[PDB]
Design a protein around this ligand. Structure first.
Ligand SMILES: Cc1cc2nc3c(=O)[nH]c(=O)nc-3n(C[C@H](O)[C@H](O)[C@H](O)COP(=O)(O)O)c2cc1C
Ligand SMILES: Cc1cc2nc3c(=O)[nH]c(=O)nc-3n(C[C@H](O)[C@H](O)[C@H](O)COP(=O)(O)O)c2cc1C
Ligand SMILES: COc1ccc2c(CCc3c(C(=O)O)[nH]c(=O)[nH]c3=O)cccc2c1
Ligand SMILES: COc1ccc2c(CCc3c(C(=O)O)[nH]c(=O)[nH]c3=O)cccc2c1
Lengths: 313, 313
C-alpha cells in the first residue's frame, strides 16, 4: 500500500502539499515545509517587486474555515527564484513556484527568468489566475479573454510545461468555457482547483463588526465552507481536460477529505486553511488517515481510485 | 417587545419567511407555511406548465448544509395564481409568488396575468433570475445583458413593484455591474440575496458516490456552507442599492444568523435548508432567539441595527 505518485517527470512520496500562500512566504517557511512529511511544497505567489500586502487584520479563521484579503504580501520574485536555484533541496521533495503578477507583462518578465532554472533544477511553475488585473474588471480567470491572453503570452515566454491555479466556478457554462480555454494550451499540464471562494463576508455577532480590515471586511473563503465547491471544480476539470492533471485544493482537513478530492480526479492535494491552523504536523496525520481508508477498502495505490467517483444511474 | 415591520406597503409580524422552493410547492405546504409563525411566505418558483422535475434523489442534507438539483418541480403557474387569488388568507400574512419561466416570453406571459391579482389582493412578485438562458450562456443573472432584457420586459409587462431573486456573486466588479443593472429599474423594489451556491458536488466516502442523481451529482449548495457568501451579497447590494430593500437568504439556522443578515442590511430573512430540515417550528425559535439577542444588546427595533455592520478603520 503506498501514496507514491510519479508525475510531471517527478516522484512524490505522497500527494500532499501546502496551498500557495500558506507556510511558504519566507526561507524559514520553505525550510519548514521541506522538513515536513509533505510530498511537495509550493512557494508563496510572487510579484516582481516585494510587497507588504494589506493592512492587518487581513486573515482570520473560525471553526468552519477562514477569510483572507492578504493583498499578496511576498518577498519578490528574486527571492523565490534564488530559493529555487540555490537553496532548495530537491532530494527531499519537489518544489513548485507560484507566480501572480499584477499584469500580463509582469508575468512574462518573471517566467522568462524562471525558465532556465526550471529547465536546470526542475522547479515547476504554478501560475495564479485567480488574481486581479485592472480594477473594476473581474479577476483574470473570470475574464476569459484576459485569461487566454495571459496563457498565450506565458506559454510563449516560458516554453516549458506549467500549471495554473483557478478560482472556483459556479455555472456549467463557465466550466465549459474555462476548460475549453485551458485546452488551447498544450503546455498547461496541470490545473489546480480551487483558489478561495471570492469576496465572502464574515461578521462577528458580539462586536457587530467585520473581522478583517481590507475591503470593508470582504475576502476570500477557505476551509470547510468550500469543500463541495472545490470537489465540483476538481471533477468538472477532470472530466473536461483529459490531457491534463488536476490538483485539488479546498477544504482538506482529513484523509477522508483528501480521499474525496482524489475520487473527484485530484492528483496532488493541497492544504491551506487546515495547515495554517494546525501546522505542518498535519501532513503525517493526513497520510495516516488516507492510508487507513485505503486499507479498509482494499486500495493499494492512488490510481486505483483517482477520478473513480460513481454517479447514480 | 415585538419584531413587527412594514414594507412594500404591507405589514409583517416579523422578518422571517421560507425561502422559495422550501415548504411551498403544494396547497398543503402553503397552508402549513400560512399556519406557522413566519411573518410571510413565498410560493415555489413556477413555470407556465406544471413540471415533475428531476429524477430522485435530487435533494440531500448534511450537518453543514444541503445540495439540490430539483429541476424546478412545481404545480404550474395556474395553480399558484389561484392560490394567490382565491385560497390564501391575507389577514394571516403577506404572500410572495415566485416566477421562473424558461424564457423571457414565458415570464412576460405569467406576469401579465399576475398583475391584476397583485392589484386586487396585494400578492408580491419575486422574479427568480437563476433561470435558463440562450445556448452557451450562463444562467440569466450571470449574463448581465440578458438580465437587463428580462427586467425591461417584465417591468413593462407587469408595471407594478416587484423583486428579484439573485444568485451569489464572487467578484467586486460583478457586484458593481449587477447592482447598476438592477438600479435601472425603479419597479425593482427588493432584491433577495442569495440563491444556492451553484454546482457544488457532495461525495460520500463510504459508497464512493455522489449523493444526488441529476447532473452527475452537481447541484446548488445551501445551509452553513453559504452564510459568509450570503452576508457578502446582502451587504454588497445593500450598499449599492440605497433605494431598494434587500432580503437575505442563505445559511440561517439561528436568531444569531438572522441577526447577522439584518446587520448586513436584510429587511426580511428567508430560511431554506434549516426549514427543510427542522420544519416550520423553526420560526418560533428564530423569533425568540433574535429577540433575545436584541434584548441583551439593548436594541428595541430592527431599524436600530439594520445595515449597521461595523468595518475596521
Ligand atoms: C492566508 C492565505 C493566503 C493565500 N495566498 C495565496 C496565494 O498567494 N496564491 C494562491 O494561489 N492562493 C492563495 N491562497 C489560497 C489558498 O492557496 C487556497 O487556494 C484556498 O485557501 C483554499 O484552500 P483551503 O480551503 O485549504 O484553505 C491563500 C489562502 C490563504 C488562507
Ligand atoms: C429543495 C430546494 C428547492 C429550491 N427551489 C428554489 C426555487 O424554486 N426558487 C428559488 O428562488 N430558490 C430555490 N431554492 C433556493 C433557496 O430559496 C435558497 O435561496 C437557498 O437554499 C439558500 O438558502 P439556505 O441556505 O437557507 O438553504 C431552493 C432550495 C432548495 C434547497
Ligand atoms: C490588493 O492587491 C491584491 C493582490 C492579490 C490579490 C489576490 C491574489 C492573491 C491571493 C490572495 C491574497 O493575497 O489576498 N488570497 C487568496 O486567498 N488567494 C490569492 O490568490 C486575490 C484577491 C485580492 C488581491 C489583492
Ligand atoms: C430545465 O431544468 C431547470 C432546472 C432549474 C431551474 C430553475 C432554478 C430553480 C431552482 C432550483 C431547482 O428547482 O433546482 N434549486 C435552487 O436551489 N434554486 C433554484 O432557483 C429556474 C428556472 C428553470 C429551471 C429549469
Amino acid at each position: 500500500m503506498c501514496l507514491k505518485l510519479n508525475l510531471l517527470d517527478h516522484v512524490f512520496a505522497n500527494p500532499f502539499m501546502n496551498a500557495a500562500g500558506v507556510l511558504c512566504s519566507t526561507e524559514e517557511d520553505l525550510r519548514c515545509m521541506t522538513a515536513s512529511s509533505s510530498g511537495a511544497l509550493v512557494s508563496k505567489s510572487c510579484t516582481s517587486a516585494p510587497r507588504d500586502g494589506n493592512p492587518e487584520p487581513r486573515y482570520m479563521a473560525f471553526p468552519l474555515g477562514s477569510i483572507n484579503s492578504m493583498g499578496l504580501p511576498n518577498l519578490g520574485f528574486d527571492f523565490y527564484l534564488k530559493y529555487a536555484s540555490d537553496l532548495h533541496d530537491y532530494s527531499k521533495k519537489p518544489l513548485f513556484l507560484s507566480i501572480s503578477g499584477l499584469s500580463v507583462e509582469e508575468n512574462v518578465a518573471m517566467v522568462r527568468r524562471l525558465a532556465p532554472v526550471a529547465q536546470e533544477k526542475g522547479v515547476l511553475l504554478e501560475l495564479n489566475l485567480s488574481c486581479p488585473n485592472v480594477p473594476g474588471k473581474p479577476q483574470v480567470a473570470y475574464d476569459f479573454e484576459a485569461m487566454r491572453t495571459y496563457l498565450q503570452q506565458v506559454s510563449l515566454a516560458y516554453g516549458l510545461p506549467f500549471g495554473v491555479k483557478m478560482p472556483p466556478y459556479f455555472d456549467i457554462a463557465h466550466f465549459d468555457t474555462a476548460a475549453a480555454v485551458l485546452n488551447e494550451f498544450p503546455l498547461v499540464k496541470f490545473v489546480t482547483c480551487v483558489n478561495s471562494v471570492g469576496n465572502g463576508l464574515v461578521i462577528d455577532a458580539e462586536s457587530e463588526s467585520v473581522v478583517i480590515k481590507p475591503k470593508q471586511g470582504f475576502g476570500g473563503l477557505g476551509g470547510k465552507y468550500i469543500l463541495p465547491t472545490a470537489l465540483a471544480n476538481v471533477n468538472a476539470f477532470y472530466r473536461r481536460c483529459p490531457d491534463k492533471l488536476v490538483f485539488g485544493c479546498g477544504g482538506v482537513y482529513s484523509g477522508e477529505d483528501a480521499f474525496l478530492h482524489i475520487l473527484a480526479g485530484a492528483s496532488m492535494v493541497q492544504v491551506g486553511t487546515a495547515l495554517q491552523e494546525e501546522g505542518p504536523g498535519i501532513f503525517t496525520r493526513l497520510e495516516d488517515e488516507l492510508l487507513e481508508i485505503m486499507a479498509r477498502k482494499g486500495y493499494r495505490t492512488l490510481e486505483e481510485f483517482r477520478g473513480r467517483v460513481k454517479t447514480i444511474e
